[PDB]
């Protein structure tokens, strides 16, 4: 879904993201803040940004009106491919032209992106040392991340809520690199005694 869906942002960050990284016609979808778990289409038109609410009924998606769809992606495809079907109060047409990609949280090499728990356990045991760590995306809680650490291998969920990064609680961090740097210096302790030392990175190989 990364080509157009941004799970950890807000209307405000979607605005900024569309106005900096985007062009007129650029759009993204995101969770709703005014009614979870609806979704929201944020769209850039003629230098400004408009937010459109998507209803989540459990059996379909729609725009509180109009056609209904099995998936969010089908709804988005529909309004990309049928022009004039999306009109403001003034009757101005809203055009969904260019999906804005969800960028990776960092460009450091210990970030592996899409990667499973098991793939992380393999790479780390058969190519890392004790205290070898990486960060990856969470498949159990999409939108979140995971710190994968050689010690056996331990996985720690990294929550991303409102652009903040924490390790389940404790200090919220600005960027994913702040959280990693901070926990190298000051090791975290799992609640079974084990200290998760981040000793050396296991970088991606390409």
């Amino acid at each position: 879904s990364r080509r157009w869906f941004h799970p950890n942002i807000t209307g405000v960050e979607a605005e900024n993201l569309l106005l900096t990284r985007g062009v007129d016609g650029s759009f993204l979808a995101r969770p709703s803040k005014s009614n979870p778990g609806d979704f929201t289409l944020s769209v850039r038109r003629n230098g400004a940004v408009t937010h459109i609410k998507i209803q989540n009924t459990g059996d379909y998606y729609d725009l509180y009106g109009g056609e209904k769809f099995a998936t969010l992606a089908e709804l988005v495809q529909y309004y990309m491919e049928h022009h004039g079907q999306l009109k403001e109060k003034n009757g101005d047409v809203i055009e969904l032209k260019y999906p804005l990609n969800c960028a990776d949280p960092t460009s450091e090499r210990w970030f592996h992106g899409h990667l499973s728990g098991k793939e992380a356990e393999k790479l780390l045991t058969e190519k890392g040392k004790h205290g070898s760590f990486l960060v990856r995306e969470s498949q159990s809680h999409p939108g979140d991340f995971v710190l994968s650490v050689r010690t056996k291998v331990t996985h720690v969920m990294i929550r991303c809520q409102e652009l903040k990064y924490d390790v389940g609680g404790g200090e919220r961090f600005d960027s994913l690199t702040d959280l990693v740097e901070h926990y190298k210096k000051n090791p975290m302790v799992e609640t079974l005694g084990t200290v998760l030392q981040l000793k050396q990175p296991l970088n991606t190989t390409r």
Partner: peptide
């Protein structure tokens, strides 16, 4: 199983 962290 993923691990928890308190403080």
């Amino acid at each position: 199983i993923y691990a928890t962290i308190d403080d």
